[PDB]
């Protein structure tokens, strides 16, 4: 049978509530939402922190002092990628804690079809995306993509590689900071991935497994 | 409608399949499904040892077993086990890290209990993180110590969200655990207070009793509707 609907998982804000069907044996069910309660923001953040504060080759050789700090700070703040894929974010929008930012970030699903995972990420299956939290140090957004097994793919070209600028800020920003670089650099991930490297926080299994991730360098490399 | 079953979680061991599902609007249905593949080392082994040489209500008759079994083993369990820390142990924070025991004077190692597979959501409801003891080669049972802690990373003793002894590991079985150390807390419908007198929480190190005398009563009133 049923189980209890959970709480509104925030009163300061907007947040998600979820359920545990809970079937039967051997199996399990559950089920997510997410719920709304009432309380310049994307513009008038970074901005504090810059407007004041202040060929492929080339651009992964750039040591511009504002592009080398910014990429610290932003590994120096965004979220672990979670070891699976959070199933709850299919339809819904979802809600995950951070063990080691000891914080809240919310996380859409970047699998859709302006995302093209068959051209950028052409190992994965499905991609999530961090969001600009309301109290967010950077335009930067943590990617994660996964595989068939639900898994995260770490290693090779289709990982989760932070992104600079989040489609929430500018999805053409991002694209022209984030993609037209690495569109540039004709797939070639090993050379995208060791300027823009991807993330496993949380230090889940590598993946794809060893042997199979050189016949990727090799094939790459061509 | 529906959507796919996806592949199994591993290869090199055992998983699970999980399958999502058109909801409603800004929600998502889903479900998961076990799998076994083959490869368990000392958990059938230093047990095994310690098994062999040993107008009604279906909760009432849980908390009325005066099995033999059952009470000789939760005393050794509540001997054996460790005390809970008074405090989140930071470093465990990806999975696992060893912490040495006051009262056993003894290292014991902790994994982190705190994922979604957890649902803190529903089960410790108050809590923010989990842990629980690991089978130690010289435990003496299958049983590991639950402690769950809060935002400001202190151990919440009582209440819905509080470190519950586990008498069957996930180590040794994630489903022989479920049916005995889960399977009845569900069937007392989320009284806590039902289920934590039968399955004592611990606070050995006698920490700060959490949550507050104000706020443990708001939770009398509530938790026994739900
Ligand atoms: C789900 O919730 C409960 C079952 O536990 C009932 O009110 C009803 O069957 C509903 O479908
Ligand atoms: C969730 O399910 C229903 C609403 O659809 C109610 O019984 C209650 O809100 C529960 O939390
Ligand atoms: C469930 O419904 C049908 C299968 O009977 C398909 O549209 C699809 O496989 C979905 O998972
Ligand atoms: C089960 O669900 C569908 C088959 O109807 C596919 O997504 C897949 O083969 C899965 O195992």
């Known amino acids: 049978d049923w189980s209890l609907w959970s709480v509104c998982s925030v009163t300061c804000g907007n947040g998600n509530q979820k359920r545990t069907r809970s079937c039967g044996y051997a199996c ?15 513009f008038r953040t970074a901005a504090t922190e810059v407007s004041l504060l202040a060929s492929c080759e080339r651009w992964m050789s750039c040591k511009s002092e504002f592009l080398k700090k910014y990429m610290h700070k932003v590994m120096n703040d965004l979220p672990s990628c979670p070891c699976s894929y959070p199933t709850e974010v299919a339809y819904s929008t979802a809600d995950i804690f951070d063990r080691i930012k000891r914080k809240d970030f919310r996380w859409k699903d970047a699998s859709g079809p302006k995302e093209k995972l068959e051209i950028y990420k052409p190992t994965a299956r499905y991609c999530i995306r961090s969001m600009l939290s309301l109290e967010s140090t950077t335009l930067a957004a943590q990617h994660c993509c996964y595989g068939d097994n639900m898994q995260l793919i770490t290693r090779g070209k289709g990982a989760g590689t932070p992104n600079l600028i989040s489609t929430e800020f500018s999805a053409e920003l991002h694209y022209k900071v984030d993609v037209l670089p690495w569109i540039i650099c004709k797939g070639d991930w090993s050379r995208y991935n060791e300027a823009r490297p991807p993330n496993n926080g949380q230090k889940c299994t590598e993946s794809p497994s060893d042997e199979d991730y050189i016949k990727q360098f090799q094939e790459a490399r061509e």
Not at 28 to 42: K, V
């Open 28 to 42: 399990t069910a559950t089920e997510s939402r997410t719920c709304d309660r009432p309380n310049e923001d994307t």
